[PDB]
Subunit: 385 residues, 4 copies
């Protein structure tokens, strides 16, 4: 189960680079140099890395220090063959963003947030990124009167519209992906799920430039079914990027390695991404637990990719099994894919077999055979088939 | 705190009519005749009632029994002055709907579900309803292989598109509202939150005919902030109807009387509906607990309306208080309402005060004063101001 | 992965017998005769069955009908070799129990609840049950003033003490197990978790007669770690019985077949039960989904036992793997099992290597190697080792 | 609603002193000197302060620096009249505790954790504390194989037993209180709720020395009813201390000011503490949001005490209202307080009115009148009575 760059596995610099500072504890690991993370990830078989502006260029750096940080980084990409498919902006760490970036109540902060974003979009394009992610982690509230949400959504639309005007006027080939999260670090965060972000995009001036970047653990912090949410994003044509990790239920954002947390949900997610032909990066937004030393960091990163490849094999064996194909027909998955009324409304209204003469008790008695289908899926996941 | 019909309080026949059968227990109350519910609700000050087809006309009735059920009902509306602003279809109780109505795997069930819906739309229009609600309570799955969600969303879009073609071809003045719920009775339900339903509507053929009917307790079953979700529906222009009740956190759907459950969320909800000028029905989808006899049923229904009027008074006193208006300015709510960059992109890019010369430490040190604002809101809610 | 009666798999009559009535829907399956369930479960390899009084003898039966129901049942046990290891009382279905049985506010209901329980204890002993379960599903409240919880706990202690006096005065060899659940059907249920039930038992007059009967899905409805809760019950010597099933997070009680829901938690549970030598029944309290016909019922029941045996094999391979044994030592699980200070308090206080001369930075730098250990466990679960 | 020291309101130095560092953001406020917090809290009307060892004496201080830190602190207590009713140990911040203190897998860490605790117990006694709290925030796991929980509970019992032997051998008048939390910062924390901690205490060598210190928000992170959990702790005689704050549901630990979060639960909590005559400190373990400057910190602290006094007044008016006293009798709260069977088992068994002649349908038809009672409680809370 050996990854290669063709598997398109990517990692944020902030993932393997997390020093282990949590709300109750100091860092347990020293800082990693971005150049060393690139080299170690290349050796594990990764395809590329992603970054926030402040992961790569320390906040407050002079333009001359900035050029030197970028030069060293680009040399490590050249040395390794690693790509940079995605970048994003840190609009959450510095105290100035304590009430948000794009939806801060203070107008001057909002203007600053936009300039900081636009500067990094230029750098992202220079490094070859195709997707620019926005995670509005400070956009939200702990109390009801602090944030008029209609005005805040106006400000959010204004900010994304301005970013769209900027990339189109520069002729940049880059698209935006919104990363939802329901809460943490704010008490409630605006656009809290996949669905809210999809709905918001449809009110932007150029909707074709925006999609979503859903994260496994974030939809599970609302108790939602992550493969279902991804299916709706694929259906809408909006799955531009994805963040893979693990989460044990409704609690703080754990960012466990992918495959930990809800294992059956990981299986159904991989089944869907592979069936649907998702061709974007398989990106891991995860945190090696702060119990670990650096050997544990790299073992945790390797585990992310290993678990994806094991689940990919098991999902492919499931779909290819003639006995499963039979069970899918027994459960009428084929009939779900056929139109309800391609004959049209008037024919439906005239069809007495659809109502006047429909035998409701005979249809009701038909079992769906879902439990046998699900146990076949369990046997495949466990290698008992 | 006396309600009158001008307050537009409405109730489903299934609310005060709930007999108290739960998954573990038999009914504790006898069935109510719809005519007696209309009369008792009118005496309490309600404005009108709502119904599922099967609440008013027992499933399986002949067309002659159907006419008699409707005639009696219409006579009680005439006798009382009660309106029927909304109706909906029962596509969840009968065993034929065990895998869904519009997204059942069996095609013949889906056709039946549409015919059953269209029949009730005609009746709804005849009784004067302006909103037709769809709650897809059986649309979903307990296991991952049972439902291909992309195909199911195709079937869901097909069904709503056909309903839109029907009302437009009949010239009916009625609009549709989707009522989301994340789970129960299915393990996961399709379109599980406000956001997912809003996003789905934008892919329908005639989006202007569809909005949402959010319910307090359902968004709280995903741990989401219900006033925030309503703000996004208002922002999108899609709040066609609302279901008011109470819920204590993430658990089974309690449908407590409005004001029970999360009381501060009820306060902020009423503040928003009244501030924004929502003019639709204030509809209660609630269940008097099965501990209660019929006197407890009517006390519970009266409590719904009482609690709305108390919270309406407290929210109005809050917004009118000069000290609160001062605090809103101290917290820069006024600045949230002003455009970030009405001067445009190029001027933003040339504005050195937005970045090169922006004093990030001075802006960071400014307190938001949200805790003082929130305690003013608490004092108002509690009548300590 | 074939079960036999030696595996001690048991099922409630109410599990495979669930007709599929949920809060929103009518039954989808006809009632099963208890004699046919016994026969079909024996053919699948089960060891025995369990029952509520009202599952076996319809509520309200005459003493003569009661004897006939029991005789037929005992003949099916004789015909099959099936055992009855556990029984329990239905104190939740009939409307008289709408505010509880042992903690109903009405004293006459509480007396009735005790007499109904004592009658079934006699029958349980006659059928050979060794454990008598109490699930206080109606003991609780939807509102804060309805139940003084200190008085209710006095009533709960009174009821269990009286049951203890009854079995000791009759010379019965039977023990009691309390089954916790946090909510549903009441808004909050008294003794909501394993921990609350363990603490309560220690205040009973004869604590040695009472233990717990935890259920997978119920502790997961509070977001708790079920194998951790079972470890604490084993540590206290109180794991008298267990209910096995599956649950997807914090929501209504799903009672999915065992192995569905949180699969990794099922693996760690089986590891613990087998390591610790739990010798009681492996009881499944589950509901075949109401999508299923009777063939799906028996496939779902068979899946419960299959998944236990697969996980038993994988947990045994994990613990027996020399590479895992090495990793357990790398993670210092051996050191966790050794006393912190068998040398005693005074020696600890005099030990300068414990504080004055303890090198806190060297100890802090040691990685725990938990991620490598956890990936070995993942590889074993998935059959990738 | 003015607090005075007689109200026994206390605050941790770490509460108003929280600098606002969260998992995603740097500190927004400078550090406060413990002497200035004592002075400002005294001016607001507080009764006293609490501390972790490392809040008062910076980690790593020499014995000479330690004496100077304590001297300054004691002078501010003398200057203000502020008391120190409780103290506790920081066994979570330093990296050495990354796998726990009392249940760390490494034995040398566990020994160090005990010595660090014993040193602070001596200081606590010198400052007059009567309660010593233990919050085992690092005791737990992110993965199933990392922690054998039976061995860990042996280590936890060993540590608390050694602390009990120490205080008894020194003749100290101090008692221990365990503070449960279900998760955060570990994936699952050992003794996760009130109930688990109560059960654990009963297995200690000297159980009379240990009680619980429950926190509002922590039981609500498991979706549990906090006033119910406090009632069980009072019933067991184990409520030694309490942490008051606010939480909005199942998510990260918010530590909002008391009265925020679940307001009705705050009302029922105050009702119970005052009814039962709890005489310990009313301690606030809360975090002023990092949006706030120092003026917001003190407004947030003042709000904690204000909201307690408002709810105390409303709960007292509720219980004193003759109409509520009538409703309590209508709901048979008086009958809940009377013994089920003070006549004894044999008389219960001979009482035909308890079963053979009990009219189950007449008892079932009696309404509980809980909704009217709950609306009276709502009217009192809102000042509408
Ligand atoms: Mg995350
Ligand atoms: Mg992410
Ligand atoms: Mg509901
Ligand atoms: Mg509703
Ligand atoms: Mg259950
Ligand atoms: Mg059970
Ligand atoms: Mg807390
Ligand atoms: Mg605390």
């Amino acid at each position: 189960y050996q990854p290669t760059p063709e598997d398109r596995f990517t990692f944020g610099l902030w993932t393997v680079g997390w020093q282990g500072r949590d709300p109750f504890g100091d860092a347990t690991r020293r800082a990693l140099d971005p150049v060393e993370s690139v080299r170690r990830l290349a050796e594990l078989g990764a395809h590329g890395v992603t970054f926030h502006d402040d992961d790569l260029i320390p906040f407050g750096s002079s333009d001359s220090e900035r050029e030197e940080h970028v030069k060293r980084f680009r040399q490590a990409l050249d040395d390794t063959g690693m790509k940079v498919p995605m970048a994003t902006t840190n609009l959450f760490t510095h105290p100035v963003f304590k009430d948000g970036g794009f939806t801060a109540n203070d107008r001057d902060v909002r203007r600053y947030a936009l300039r900081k974003t636009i500067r990094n979009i230029d750098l992202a394009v220079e490094l070859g990124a195709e997707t620019y992610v926005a995670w509005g982690g400070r956009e939200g509230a702990e109390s009801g009167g602090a944030k008029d949400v209609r005005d805040a959504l106006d400000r959010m639309k204004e900010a994304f519209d301005l970013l769209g005007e900027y990339v189109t006027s520069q002729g940049y080939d880059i698209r935006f992906a919104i990363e939802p999260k329901p809460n943490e670090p704010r008490g409630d965060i605006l656009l809290p799920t996949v669905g809210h972000a999809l709905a918001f995009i449809e009110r932007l001036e150029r909707p074709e430039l925006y999609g979503v970047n859903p994260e496994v653990g974030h939809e599970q912090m609302a108790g939602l079914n992550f493969p279902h949410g991804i299916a709706q994003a694929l259906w809408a044509g909006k799955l531009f990027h994805i963040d893979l990790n693990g989460q044990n239920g409704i609690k703080y954002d754990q960012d466990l390695r992918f495959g930990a947390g809800d294992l059956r949900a990981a299986f159904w997610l991989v089944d869907l991404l592979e069936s649907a032909g998702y061709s974007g990066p398989r990106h891991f937004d995860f945190k090696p637990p702060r119990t670990e030393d650096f050997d544990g960091v790299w073992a945790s990163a390797a585990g992310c990719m290993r678990n994806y490849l094991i689940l990919k094999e098991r999902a492919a064996a499931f779909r290819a099994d003639p006995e499963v194909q039979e069970a899918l027909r027994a459960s009428r998955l084929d009939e779900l894919a056929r139109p309800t009324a391609a004959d049209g409304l008037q024919a439906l209204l005239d069809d007495r077999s659809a109502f006047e003469e429909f035998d409701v008790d005979a249809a009701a008695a038909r079992g769906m055979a879902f439990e046998r289908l699900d146990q076949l899926a369990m046997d495949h996941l466990l290698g008992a088939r």
